[PDB]
Structure 1
Amino acid sequence: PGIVELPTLEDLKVQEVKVSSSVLKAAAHHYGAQCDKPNKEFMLCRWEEKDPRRCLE
Protein backbone atom coordinates (compact mmCIF):
# COMPACT_ATOMS: atom_id res chain seq x y z
CA PRO A 1 0.00 0.00 0.00
CA GLY A 2 1.38 3.36 -1.11
CA ILE A 3 4.28 4.41 -3.32
CA VAL A 4 7.79 5.09 -2.04
CA GLU A 5 9.04 8.45 -3.29
CA LEU A 6 12.74 8.70 -4.14
CA PRO A 7 14.60 11.84 -5.30
CA THR A 8 16.01 11.70 -8.80
CA LEU A 9 19.72 11.40 -9.55
CA GLU A 10 19.88 15.12 -10.38
CA ASP A 11 18.90 15.89 -6.78
CA LEU A 12 21.76 13.72 -5.46
CA LYS A 13 24.52 15.21 -7.63
CA VAL A 14 27.13 17.10 -5.59
CA GLN A 15 30.87 17.73 -5.61
CA GLU A 16 32.11 14.81 -3.52
CA VAL A 17 35.13 14.82 -1.22
CA LYS A 18 37.79 12.62 -2.83
CA VAL A 19 40.27 12.33 0.06
CA SER A 20 41.09 9.15 1.97
CA SER A 21 40.44 8.23 5.59
CA SER A 22 43.95 9.20 6.73
CA VAL A 23 43.60 12.66 5.19
CA LEU A 24 40.28 13.15 6.98
CA LYS A 25 41.75 11.90 10.27
CA ALA A 26 44.74 14.26 10.05
CA ALA A 27 42.47 17.33 9.90
CA ALA A 28 39.56 15.84 11.86
CA HIS A 29 39.94 18.11 14.90
CA HIS A 30 40.34 21.30 12.87
CA TYR A 31 37.51 20.24 10.56
CA GLY A 32 35.23 19.74 13.55
CA ALA A 33 36.28 23.07 15.05
CA GLN A 34 35.73 25.06 11.84
CA CYS A 35 32.78 23.33 10.13
CA ASP A 36 30.76 22.75 13.31
CA LYS A 37 27.69 24.85 12.48
CA PRO A 38 26.56 23.20 9.19
CA ASN A 39 27.42 19.71 10.46
CA LYS A 40 25.44 20.26 13.66
CA GLU A 41 22.49 21.67 11.70
CA PHE A 42 22.50 18.63 9.41
CA MET A 43 22.83 16.26 12.38
CA LEU A 44 19.91 17.88 14.21
CA CYS A 45 17.77 17.74 11.06
CA ARG A 46 18.75 14.08 10.61
CA TRP A 47 17.73 13.07 14.14
CA GLU A 48 14.58 15.22 14.05
CA GLU A 49 13.11 14.31 10.66
CA LYS A 50 14.12 10.62 10.87
CA ASP A 51 14.11 10.63 7.06
CA PRO A 52 17.14 10.76 4.72
CA ARG A 53 15.02 12.34 1.97
CA ARG A 54 14.38 15.42 4.16
CA CYS A 55 18.05 16.35 4.67
CA LEU A 56 19.61 16.54 1.20
CA GLU A 57 20.16 20.31 1.23
Structure 2
Amino acid sequence: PGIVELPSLEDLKVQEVKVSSSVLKAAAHHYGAQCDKPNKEFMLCRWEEKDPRRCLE
Protein backbone atom coordinates (compact mmCIF):
# COMPACT_ATOMS: atom_id res chain seq x y z
CA PRO A 1 0.00 0.00 0.00
CA GLY A 2 1.85 3.06 1.30
CA ILE A 3 5.39 3.66 2.54
CA VAL A 4 6.27 4.14 6.18
CA GLU A 5 7.82 7.42 7.32
CA LEU A 6 10.54 6.50 9.77
CA PRO A 7 12.76 9.30 11.12
CA SER A 8 16.51 9.78 10.86
CA LEU A 9 19.33 8.30 12.94
CA GLU A 10 20.76 11.77 13.60
CA ASP A 11 17.55 12.54 15.48
CA LEU A 12 17.58 9.02 16.96
CA LYS A 13 20.86 9.50 18.85
CA VAL A 14 20.56 10.82 22.40
CA GLN A 15 22.93 9.64 25.11
CA GLU A 16 21.12 7.25 27.43
CA VAL A 17 21.28 7.38 31.20
CA LYS A 18 23.58 4.36 31.15
CA VAL A 19 23.28 3.46 34.80
CA SER A 20 22.64 -0.08 35.84
CA SER A 21 19.14 -1.15 36.75
CA SER A 22 19.40 -2.00 40.46
CA VAL A 23 20.66 1.48 41.37
CA LEU A 24 17.95 2.86 39.07
CA LYS A 25 15.41 1.02 41.21
CA ALA A 26 17.16 2.09 44.42
CA ALA A 27 16.85 5.79 43.55
CA ALA A 28 13.35 5.58 42.11
CA HIS A 29 11.15 7.30 44.73
CA HIS A 30 12.99 10.62 44.74
CA TYR A 31 13.31 10.26 40.97
CA GLY A 32 9.52 10.21 40.89
CA ALA A 33 9.11 13.01 43.42
CA GLN A 34 11.25 15.93 42.24
CA CYS A 35 11.78 14.95 38.61
CA ASP A 36 9.17 13.01 36.58
CA LYS A 37 7.03 16.15 36.71
CA PRO A 38 7.26 17.01 32.96
CA ASN A 39 7.16 13.38 31.80
CA LYS A 40 3.49 12.95 32.62
CA GLU A 41 3.22 15.33 29.68
CA PHE A 42 5.26 12.72 27.77
CA MET A 43 3.10 9.83 28.93
CA LEU A 44 -0.11 11.72 28.15
CA CYS A 45 1.33 12.42 24.67
CA ARG A 46 1.94 8.68 24.32
CA TRP A 47 -1.47 7.51 25.52
CA GLU A 48 -3.39 10.11 23.51
CA GLU A 49 -1.31 9.78 20.32
CA LYS A 50 -0.14 6.16 20.24
CA ASP A 51 2.75 6.90 17.87
CA PRO A 52 6.32 6.55 19.00
CA ARG A 53 8.13 8.58 16.27
CA ARG A 54 5.61 11.33 17.12
CA CYS A 55 6.20 12.00 20.86
CA LEU A 56 9.98 11.44 21.04
CA GLU A 57 11.03 15.03 21.81
Normalised TM-score (structure 1) = 0.91
> Bigger relative contact order, structure 1 or 2, given CA contacts below 8 A and separation 6+?
1
- Tell me the equivalent position of 1:9: 9
Unaligned stretches of 5+ residues in structure 2: none
- Partner of 2:38, secondary structure, is helix
**Which secondary structure does the structure 1 equivalent of 2:29 belong to?**
helix
Structure 1 residue ranges without an equivalent (≥5): none
> 1 or 2, which has the higher helix percentage?
1
How far 1:36 sits from its partner (Å)?
Answer: 2.3
How many residues align? The count is 57
Query: Structure 1 CA distance, aligned partners of 2:2 and 2:8?
Result: 19
* 4+ residue runs over 6 A deviation: none
Counterpart CA distance in 2 for 1:53 and 1:26 is 30
CA drift of 1:16 comes to 0.7
Question: 2:36 and 2:18 mapped to 1: Cα distance?
Answer: 20
Normalising by structure 2, report the TM-score. Answer: 0.91
In 1, Cα distance between equivalents of 2:47 and 2:6: 19
Root-mean-square deviation over aligned CA pairs: 0.8
User: Displacement of 1:39 after TM fit?
Assistant: 1.6
